[PDB]
C-alpha cells in the first residue's frame, strides 16, 4: 500500500588524496533508480532501474546539475564541520544526508524528512512539522541558528510536500510492474543436528518484496527473542529479498517451536510447524 522516495548522499574526505568521494543514490521503496559517483568517468547521474531510462535528456541533464550542486555543498560541509569540532586536517571524516517523502495507500503525502549525520551520528534533522530542527549537539546548534536565519525549512517543506510527492507518483506509475507489486515470501524451515542432543531450526523467507518482514520463533506460544539469531534482510540481486531466523534447541523438543512470518503479501500471517 504505502510508498517512499528517498535520496541518500555520502561524502568522505580523503586528506592529501584529492577531493572528497561523493556518492548519491535514489530509491523508490526498496528499488534503486539512480546513482552518481564522483570517482566515475561519466560525471553523470545514471539510471539504475529500467523504468527511469525513458526519462528524456532534460531530466538527465537537470539531475546531473543538481547532484553536482549537492556534491559541492558537502565538499564545503566537510571543511566547516572540521572547524566546528576542532578536528585535524589529516583524518578522514564522513557526512551523510538523506531526504524524501512517504505517501500512504491513496498516494497522498504522509511524512517528509531531511536528516544529516557527521561521522555516523545524528547531526541535524528536520522535525515532523517541517518547520523546525532537532540539533544533536552544540556544533549542530550553530547550523540550526544559520538555517533558521536563512529560512531553510521553508524551502525544504515546499519540495517535500509537493515536488517529492509528484515525482514519486510519476515513478510509481511508470514503473508500475516493478514498483506496485508485492511478492509474498516463500517460506520453509530447515533442521540440522549440531550434536547428538541439539538441533538448529532455521526459518526462511525467500523471494519477497518489499523488504519489510517480521520472522519470529515461539516456544509453546512464548516468544524466543533473546534466543533467536536474526540476520539482516538481504537482497537476492533480482529485485527480491531474503531473511532467516534461527534457534538452537534440544533434540526432541522440535514440536514445541513454531516460526511466524508477517509480510504485506501474505493474505494472513503464516505459522510454520514441525508437525
Amino acid at each position: 500500500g504505502s510508498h517512499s522516495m528517498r535520496y541518500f548522499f555520502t561524502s568522505v574526505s580523503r586528506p592529501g588524496r584529492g577531493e572528497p568521494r561523493f556518492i548519491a543514490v535514489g530509491y523508490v521503496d526498496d528499488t534503486q533508480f539512480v546513482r552518481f559517483d564522483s570517482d566515475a568517468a561519466s560525471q553523470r547521474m545514471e539510471p539504475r532501474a529500467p523504468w527511469i531510462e525513458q526519462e528524456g535528456p532534460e531530466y538527465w541533464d537537470g539531475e546531473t546539475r543538481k547532484v553536482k550542486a549537492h556534491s559541492q555543498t558537502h565538499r564545503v560541509d566537510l571543511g566547516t564541520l572540521r572547524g566546528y569540532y576542532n578536528q585535524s586536517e589529516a583524518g578522514s571524516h564522513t557526512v551523510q544526508r538523506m531526504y524524501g517523502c512517504d505517501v500512504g495507500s491513496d498516494w497522498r503525502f504522509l511524512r517528509g524528512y531531511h536528516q544529516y549525520a557527521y561521522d555516523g551520528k545524528d547531526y541535524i534533522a528536520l522535525k515532523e512539522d517541517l518547520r523546525s530542527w532537532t540539533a544533536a549537539d552544540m556544533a549542530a546548534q550553530t547550523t540550526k541558528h544559520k538555517w533558521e536565519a536563512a529560512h531553510v525549512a521553508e524551502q525544504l517543506r515546499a519540495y517535500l510536500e509537493g515536488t517529492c510527492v509528484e515525482w514519486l507518483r510519476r515513478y510509481l506509475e511508470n514503473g508500475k510492474e516493478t514498483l506496485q507489486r508485492t511478492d509474498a515470501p516463500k517460506t520453509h524451515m530447515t533442521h540440522h543436528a549440531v550434536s547428538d542432543h541439539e538441533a538448529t531450526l532455521r526459518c526462511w523467507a525467500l523471494s519477497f518484496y518489499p523488504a519489510e518482514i517480521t520472522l519470529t520463533w515461539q516456544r509453546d506460544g512464548e516468544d524466543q527473542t533473546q534466543d533467536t539469531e536474526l540476520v539482516e534482510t538481504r537482497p537476492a540481486g533480482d529485485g527480491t529479498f531474503q531473511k532467516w531466523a534461527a534457534v538452537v534447541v534440544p533434540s526432541g523438543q522440535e514440536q514445541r517451536y513454531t516460526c511466524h512470518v508477517q509480510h504485506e503479501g501474505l493474505p494472513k500471517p503464516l505459522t510454520l510447524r514441525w508437525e
Binding site: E63, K66, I124, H151, V152, W167
Partner: peptide, 7 residues
Amino acid sequence: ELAXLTV
C-alpha cells in the same frame, strides 16, 4: 527528482 544548503 532531486531538490533550490550548507552547514
